[PDB]
Design a protein around this ligand. Structure first.
Ligand SMILES: COC(=O)Nc1nc2cc(Oc3ccc(NC(=O)Nc4cc(C(F)(F)F)ccc4F)cc3)ccc2[nH]1
Length: 299
C-alpha cells in the first residue's frame, strides 16, 4: 500500500542515538543510502553494519511521502531470506526520516559476477562454479515466489537489483534511487548504467503491462546475466522499434557462455511470448531446486 498505512512503532522504531552513520552507499535525485553501525537492532548485544535510506537536504513533502510509502511497503511485504530485510525505522520527531535495511557486503550481483570471470570453473577455494550460479538463480526464484505471494510485482528485476550478502545469500531489492540518470558524467564509467528496456517483456513495451508473469520474463533475462557472469543483455543489438518488433515475433538471445543446456531451456521458457505459458515462480522454484540437487549429486 502507501505512506498512510498504520505504523507499529513498538515493532519497528529504532533510536537515532544508536545509529552511527558512515559513508554513502548510493545517491540519486530522490534519496540517498548511507552505511551505518547500529547497536542492538536485532535485540542481541551486537553492533551491526546496516544500510540507511534517508532523504537528501531540501527534500519536499512529495519526497518524504515517497520514503514513508516505501517503509510501509516493506512492512507489508514482510520477511523472507531472499528479499531486502527491513530492520527498523526512525520516524519520530527530532531527526531525519530513516529506513534501515540489512547490509549485503558483496554488493550487487551484476558487478560481483563480472569481478569473478577469471575465478569461475564449471566444477579453486574462492572460485564460483555452476553450483554457485544455479544456487543464486534458485534463491532469486524463491524470493520472487515470496513477493508474488504478497501480491507484489517487482517491475525491474535485474542482476543489479540483487544484492549478495555473506554465505552466498542473495537478496532481491529495488533501490529506487535512479543513480545512473543522476550520476555526475565526470565520474560515470562503462558498466555504471543499464538499459531497463532490455529486461521488459514484450507486453510491457507494447501495452505498458506489468504483471508477475512479466517479472518471469525479466527473471529469464536475469538468468542470462547470471550465466554470462554479468554481461549486458542483447550484446551489440540496437534497442529500437525494430528490436521490439523482432522480440514480439520470437527472436531471443543466444545462450550465454557459462550456461548449462537446462538453464538455457529455462530462459527460453521464461521468454514465452504468451505470459500465461511462462512458468510461475513456484514452478521455477521446484525446477531450479531439482537442477540444484542434480548438480551436486554423486555418480
Ligand atoms: C559493496 O557492498 C554494498 O554496497 N552493499 C550494500 N549496498 C546496499 C545498499 C542498500 O540500499 C537500499 C537497497 C534497497 C532499499 N529498498 C528496497 O529494496 N525497497 C523495495 C524493495 C522491493 C522488493 F520487491 F525488491 F522487495 C519492493 C519495494 C521496495 F520499496 C533501500 C536501500 C541496502 C543494502 C546494501 N548492501
Amino acid at each position: 500500500h502507501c505512506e498512510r498505512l498504520p505504523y507499529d512503532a513498538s515493532k519497528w522504531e529504532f533510536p537515532r542515538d544508536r545509529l552511527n552513520l558512515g559513508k554513502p552507499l548510493g545517491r540519486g535525485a530522490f534519496g540517498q543510502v548511507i552505511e551505518a553501525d547500529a547497536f542492538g537492532i536485532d535485540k542481541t548485544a551486537t553492533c551491526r553494519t546496516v544500510a540507511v535510506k534517508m532523504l537528501k537536504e531540501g527534500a519536499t513533502h512529495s519526497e518524504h511521502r515517497a520514503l514513508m510509502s516505501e517503509l510501509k511497503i516493506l512492512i507489508h511485504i514482510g520477511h523472507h531470506l531472499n528479499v531486502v530485510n527491513l530492520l527498523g525505522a526512525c520516524t519520530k520527531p527530532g531527526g531525519p526520516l530513516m529506513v534501515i535495511v540489512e547490509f549485503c557486503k558483496f554488493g550487487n550481483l551484476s558487478t560481483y559476477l563480472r569481478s569473478k570471470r577469471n575465478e569461475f570453473v564449471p566444477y579453486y577455494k574462492d572460485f564460483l562454479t555452476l553450483e554457485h550460479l544455479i544456487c543464486y538463480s534458485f534463491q532469486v526464484a524463491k524470493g520472487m515466489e515470496f513477493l508474488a505471494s504478497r501480491k507484489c510485482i517487482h517491475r525491474d528485476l535485474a542482476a543489479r537489483n540483487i544484492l549478495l550478502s555473506e554465505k552466498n545469500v542473495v537478496k532481491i531489492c529495488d533501490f529506487g534511487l535512479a543513480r545512473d540518470i543522476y550520476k555526475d558524467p565526470d565520474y560515470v564509467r562503462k558498466g555504471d548504467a543499464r538499459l531497463p528496456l532490455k529486461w521488459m517483456a514484450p507486453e510491457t513495451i507494447f501495452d505498458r503491462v506489468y504483471t508477475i508473469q512479466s517479472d518471469v520474463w525479466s527473471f529469464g533475462v536475469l538468468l542470462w546475466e547470471i550465466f554470462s557472469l554479468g554481461a549486458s543483455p542483447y550484446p551489440g543489438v540496437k534497442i529500437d522499434e525494430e528490436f521490439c518488433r523482432r522480440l514480439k515475433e520470437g527472436t531471443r538471445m543466444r545462450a550465454p557462455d557459462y550456461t548449462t543446456p537446462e538453464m538455457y531451456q529455462t530462459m527460453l521458457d521464461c521468454w514465452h511470448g504468451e505470459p500465461s505459458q511462462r512458468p510461475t515462480f513456484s514452478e521455477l522454484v521446484e525446477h531450479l531446486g531439482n537442477l540444484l540437487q542434480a548438480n551436486a549429486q554423486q555418480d
